[PDB]
Chain A
Amino acid sequence: GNFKSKLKKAMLSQQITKSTIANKMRLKVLSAREQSLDGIFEETKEKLSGIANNRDEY
């Protein structure tokens, strides 16, 4: 019985660790995607600021 209890504890620990890693992978991926989107937005903002310099088409 004690052997079974210890084995169950070990399995629980392993399960939680594996789930943690698998989950945080998703956070990393989504963060990368949002970083790419932010880069695109910055590009657009820079182009808008540049075109703001014109004194006739403005």
Chain B
Amino acid sequence: SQKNGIATLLQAEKEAHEIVSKARKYRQDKLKQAKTDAAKEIDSYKIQKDKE
């Protein structure tokens, strides 16, 4: 009836929205990793040059 054509369908919409939200979270955390890893590597290079 209305229930299996509306409520379950909206829940499937919620599943899809959850999947895309998780994709966004992957993107965001990956970009923050791209920044933080570079930040840590530049210091490693800087100290290596400075010590010598």
Report which A residues bind B (CB closer than 8 A): 2-3
Which secondary structure dominates where chain B touches chain A? Answer: helix
Which secondary structure dominates where chain A touches chain B? Answer: helix
**B29-52 interface (Cβ within 8 A of A):** 49-50, 52
* Residue numbers in B under 8 Å from A3 (CB-CB): 49-50, 52
CB nearest neighbor in A for B45: A3
User: What 1/0 mask marks residues of chain B from 7 to 46 whose CB sits below 8 Å from any chain A CB?
Assistant: 0000000000000000000000000000000000000000
Inter-chain CA distance A2–B42, complex, in Å, is 14
Nearest Cβ in chain B — how far from A6, in angstroms?
A: 9
CB nearest neighbor in B for A7: B52
